[PDB]
Amino acid sequence: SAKALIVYGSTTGNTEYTAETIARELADAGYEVDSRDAASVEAGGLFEGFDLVLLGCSTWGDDSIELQDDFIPLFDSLEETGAQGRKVACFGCGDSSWEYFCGAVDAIEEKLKNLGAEIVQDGLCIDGDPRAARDDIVGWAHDVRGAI
Ligand SMILES: Cc1cc2nc3c(=O)[nH]c(=O)nc-3n(C[C@H](O)[C@H](O)[C@H](O)COP(=O)(O)O)c2cc1C
C-alpha cells in the first residue's frame, strides 16, 4: 500500500489531536500511516519512502509569525527532506484572534513550493478546540486523498 508520513509540531496538543484524527482517516482508507512528533525527527531525508507527507504546525510569536519550536529545525532544513516532487499537504491549529491566522501553515507551504513539492490541497487551519472541528478535519483528509 501507499505510505503516508505525518509530522506535527504541537505545544498544547491541538495540532497533535488534529494529526491523530487525520491519521485514522488515512489508515481507514488503506494508507500505511507513520505519525511522528516533530520533536523526534531529523530533517535529512525525512520524506524518503513516503507517497504522501502531511505537515502540521501551530503558530506562535509575540509580534511576528513564528513556527512551533519543535518544527523550526525541520523548516530550517526543509531543503534536505526530499520534498522535490513530493505530494504534501499542510495543517495547523491557530486562534483567529490573531490577524495571521495559522500563519505558520502558510509559511511552510510557501517554502515547500519553492522546494518543488506538489501541494495537493490548500492548508487546513483549525480555530480553537480541534475536537469541535472534527468534521472539518476528517473532510480535509478525505479531500487530500481524493486529490492525489
Ligand atoms: C504568543 C502566542 C502567539 C500566537 N500567535 C498566533 C498566530 O499568529 N496565529 C494563530 O493562528 N495563532 C496564534 N496563537 C494561537 C496558538 O497557535 C493556538 O493556541 C493553537 O491552538 C496552539 O496549537 P498547538 O496546541 O498544536 O500547539 C498564538 C498563541 C500565543 C500564545
Side-chain angles (χ1 to χ4, degrees), residues 9-15 58-61 93-95 98 100-102:
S10 185
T11 303
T12 82
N14 289 334
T15 305
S58 47
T59 306
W60 302 93
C93 291
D95 176 344
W98 295 85
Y100 297 120
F101 183 41
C102 297

Side-chain angles (χ1 to χ4, degrees), residues 8-18 56-66 68 92-104 125-130:
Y8 57 90
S10 185
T11 303
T12 82
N14 289 334
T15 305
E16 181 175 33
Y17 167 87
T18 305
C57 188
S58 47
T59 306
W60 302 93
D62 178 51
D63 73 343
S64 62
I65 302 172
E66 299 190 335
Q68 197 274 345
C93 291
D95 176 344
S96 58
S97 306
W98 295 85
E99 162 71 13
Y100 297 120
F101 183 41
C102 297
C125 175
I126 300 299
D127 201 0
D129 184 349

Side-chain angles (χ1 to χ4, degrees), residues 7 38 41 43 46-47 55 70-78 81:
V7 178
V41 307
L46 180 57
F47 304 165
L55 301 182
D70 299 316
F71 212 99
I72 289 177
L74 180 57
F75 180 88
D76 283 347
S77 293
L78 205 58
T81 57

Side-chain angles (χ1 to χ4, degrees), residues 65-128:
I65 302 172
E66 299 190 335
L67 275 52
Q68 197 274 345
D69 270 339
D70 299 316
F71 212 99
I72 289 177
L74 180 57
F75 180 88
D76 283 347
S77 293
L78 205 58
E79 78 278 12
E80 307 191 346
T81 57
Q84 325 75 208
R86 192 77 57 179
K87 298 192 182 239
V88 188
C90 301
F91 63 98
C93 291
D95 176 344
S96 58
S97 306
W98 295 85
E99 162 71 13
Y100 297 120
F101 183 41
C102 297
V105 177
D106 300 339
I108 296 163
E109 288 187 355
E110 290 305 298
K111 184 164 189 177
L112 283 168
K113 294 195 282 199
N114 290 344
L115 295 179
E118 183 185 355
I119 301 303
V120 294
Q121 200 78 359
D122 291 348
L124 172 73
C125 175
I126 300 299
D127 201 0

Side-chain angles (χ1 to χ4, degrees), residues 35-52:
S35 300
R36 303 182 196 174
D37 192 321
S40 71
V41 307
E42 284 280 291
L46 180 57
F47 304 165
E48 281 289 320
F50 286 106
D51 301 278
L52 173 66

